[PDB]
């Protein structure tokens with residue numbers, strides 16, 4: 001009953017500061033423009049200890065499956081090859097990506113009827129709000 005309140009299909013409804021987050025990560029101009037337009041669906045499911053998070057997008061589709069606390073390889077939608085670890089911290093899913101000596105953290109939390117996604121790179125934060133689809 002790990003992650004029950006996250007499971008489902010979610011649609012992006014608002015975004016703030018995402019272009020600046022992407023810049024800070026190192027995403028190039030054209031990818032930022034096309035990625036920033038997308039209104040993805042995020043599909044979260046659990047089977048035993050394995051959590052799957054899919055992003056269904058007009059930009060890129062992505063899918064990751066993982067066990068909490070257990071590092072995995074991820075190719076991000078902007079084509080970074082990263083080493084990722086996702087944990088639960090006080091009911092928040094904390095996703096850390098490491099690559100080329102850099103690190104970024106994406107937090108997913110349930111707040112009211114929303115799934116709030118906070119993306120942090122150094123001093124830059126972006127907040128993205130998803131609603132049930």
Ligand SMILES: O=C(O)Cc1ccc2c(c1)CCCCCC2
Nearest residue numbers: 022035055076077078117119128
């Ligand atoms: O899933 C989200 O809403 C947030 C989120 C965080 C990071 C990234 C994406 C999306 C995909 C687009 C490319 C930018 C870098 C990777």
